[model samples]
Target: LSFTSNDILRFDKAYDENDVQEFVNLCSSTCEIEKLRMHPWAADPKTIGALSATQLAILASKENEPHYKDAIREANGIAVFINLLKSHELDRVHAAVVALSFLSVDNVKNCICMFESGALPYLISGMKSNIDGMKAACAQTCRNIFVLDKKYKKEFLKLGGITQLVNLLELPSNYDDSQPLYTQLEAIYHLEDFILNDGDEIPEFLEAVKNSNSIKNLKTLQQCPEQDLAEASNVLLLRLT
Candidate 1:
């Protein structure tokens, strides 16, 4: 039967698996330059494709819960997003961060497959996002990849994800007055949970009871959150037992 865009909207709003799949199908099949007619993120060549991927990945993440097992396993779909990073076409150097944050372990491996397809270095290059949102996306993606397991942690770092990571930590939290809070929060949120109590068997993974530079960054952000924001990062400090 035939359905209107409104019907599709309602269905997608339900956040069901089929809804997300239809969305991905639209990305791969229906959505296009004519459909876009140039949105703001599209103004830049790099972000044009990536921005769309970001939108798709976010929707997929929301719909495909429990580490997004459904989306990851259903089709191994997100290859195009990785391609955008590789081509640097969407101006989205770190779209993976947004996508990865919501992915399951298998999805992360699927994402690693994208890297093997040759998008990894561009992903690594995103430490240089002039935009806070992009930078935050990059940082969050790295954290997501690392959180997966020891092997991924080792693989990501081994691929030169570290210097980019440290640079993300090093950037000033103070932003242009217009910068979105989401971006700033992305920057702060990734390492917000990094309090490890001890070393893991994995050489790349370790526990952190003692204070470290990563921990220090979290402390520094306590000084900088928006005035209305009331997260006691000190609580993060307190929670590390």
Candidate 2:
């Protein structure tokens, strides 16, 4: 139940097969953080509350390192990991958000599982209140979940999901012009999709875009030094046009 420097090093190290798996099993079965994992996702909880934020950061980061992403899904770790975003610790929040984003990568099932497992509120919280890194991760998470269905997207807004979304447009004071434009890119997509779909909230959507200065934001993004941002900006601008 106690972690040593050796335990810490294991997380930092490149995970060979069976390494983190053992660690995950130990945490899930024996730890005593007081909460358990959930099912449908698992017959039993995926993990316990005994897992520390540092420990989570390590595990989440490793999933991306070796890229054994399916292990996270198979283990039904999404709910547990997504809940970590509630931690006030930036390291924990950042790690958990990045892990969710990685888990969402190239997988619709993972995306929907994450979304249905109450991922949206925390992700919205991440964008609403967290820093640029977390915001970007939230951006990616939103994009993945928004792909599920128009109904989910409708819930996202009615539930005030993107109400705080515009908060992410501005950068953290220390952030560079070099950060990826996930927030900007997808904010535009969210709006463009809303307008295109002719939702009941078209007027509200347009107002939100105006308040966010999204059109200007997209134009600013077009001038972004990041090539991906520039190209995506042009495409998004075309959507608006």
Candidate 3:
């Protein structure tokens, strides 16, 4: 049976196992035109456009259900969400990134799936996005993955992820607007996780942070008006020194 955008939207309010399964199925459907180009005899394929994918992502993200998360991964929904990150549309990327953060939470298998699916680069790039919410979500998702596995952290650094996080920590000077407070906070928290959670890799992580020239931004943040931001900055500074 086929599902419409309305059907997917309705699932947002009340959905069970069957609905989750269907949504997963709907998300997996590839575009017919793309399919037809490969084979003229290919059957008509039902398409889930960017909007429906975003809706499905939002639905999955809003729930705290482990089974829903599992069903998505078991059905290969993670790759679908990863593909959505490549969309030129900002909102679609935002939804997919947030959903990914939820899926990766406390699930090492899902994190590995995301990493293996070539999601790390896009996620690192997302941290550099102009949109505050998307940038924060991307950083949060990165933390979710790297916190579970040190190898992912190594890979993250190889992709210049620390540099991106350091860039996020820049607070706006009086002369210019900067990333919103929460977004900057997200970067600070993510960097703190790397420094504190790097275990045996702490030395290398610190070296990378130092190389990124994040010390300047951390020092700048230490003087911010917000208590938490300043305190977090001070903590990172102490750790750095």
Candidate 4:
């Protein structure tokens, strides 16, 4: 028997260009399998959504290679991942963020494509997630984007993204000690870069930082036992003044 949709979807252990293209198709509404009724599993929305997440995870892992990144973008995989950000499943959202972050790494064109796809607001919204990893990934993705261009930084500030960054300075009340300090550190790095890069030029952003709780948070972090965190806070604090 030919490979059924279920069987085909299970082949996630390895992925090449064809595999990426197939998964991208499977993740789309216009998937040929769904359109042509190629298999019973094609009608299962749950399976389809899961495949999308699986595809994103695969993309994240392979995107470190230039060819893979090019293949994904060529396949219009960015739009698919962006659409998945709206998934009700948190895991899918997390995977999408990770995938997008990797895709934009050192690639200004990919960053611009993501921004044009309206991914910035979703990323800013993701900063509120209770999950530390997801929040960090979101912040990381934002940093990657804005670091490549001033236009994105301006957009991020206009979208109230600075407030989200400020909020990330404090640990979540539900935080467990097992969690890495990545999220808070990411926020701090983003803020530091924001100021060092161009925050001084943006009067409203500087005013917003002054008026918000970020100063208090940075002041508190200045006393942190973590040397890097404390130093970063001190540096950013000086910039704010």
**Candidate 2 colliding pairs:** 33-49, 33-50, 37-45, 37-46
RMSD in angstroms, candidate 4?
6.3
lDDT against true structure, model 2: 0.58
Query: Per-residue CA lDDT of candidate 1, range 22-97, in tens?
Result: 4444333222232232222323323224434455555545653554445543554455555445553443434444
lDDT of 4 by residue, 77-193 (tens): 889889978877544565567678778776677888999899999999988877666777788888878776768778988998888999999865675655556667778888867
Write down the TM-score for model 2: 0.61
What total of clashing residue pairs does each candidate reach? Answer: 7, 4, 0, 0
Q: Which ten residues in a row have the lowest lDDT in candidate 3?
A: 36-45
Report lDDT (CA) for all predictions. 0.47, 0.58, 0.70, 0.70
Winner on TM-score (1 vs 2): 2
User: Per-residue alpha-carbon lDDT of model 2 for 14-51, expressed as tens digits?
Assistant: 24444445444333222333334321111222223223
Q: Which regions of candidate 3 are displaced past 4 Å?
A: 1-18, 28-48, 173-180, 198-201
Model 1: residue 97 alpha-carbon error in angstroms: 6.2
Residue pairs with backbone overlap in model 1: 46-90, 46-91, 47-90, 47-91, 48-90, 196-208, 198-207
Write down the RMSD of all candidates, one decimal each. 7.6, 8.4, 8.0, 6.3
Give all TM-scores, in the order shown. Answer: 0.53, 0.61, 0.77, 0.79
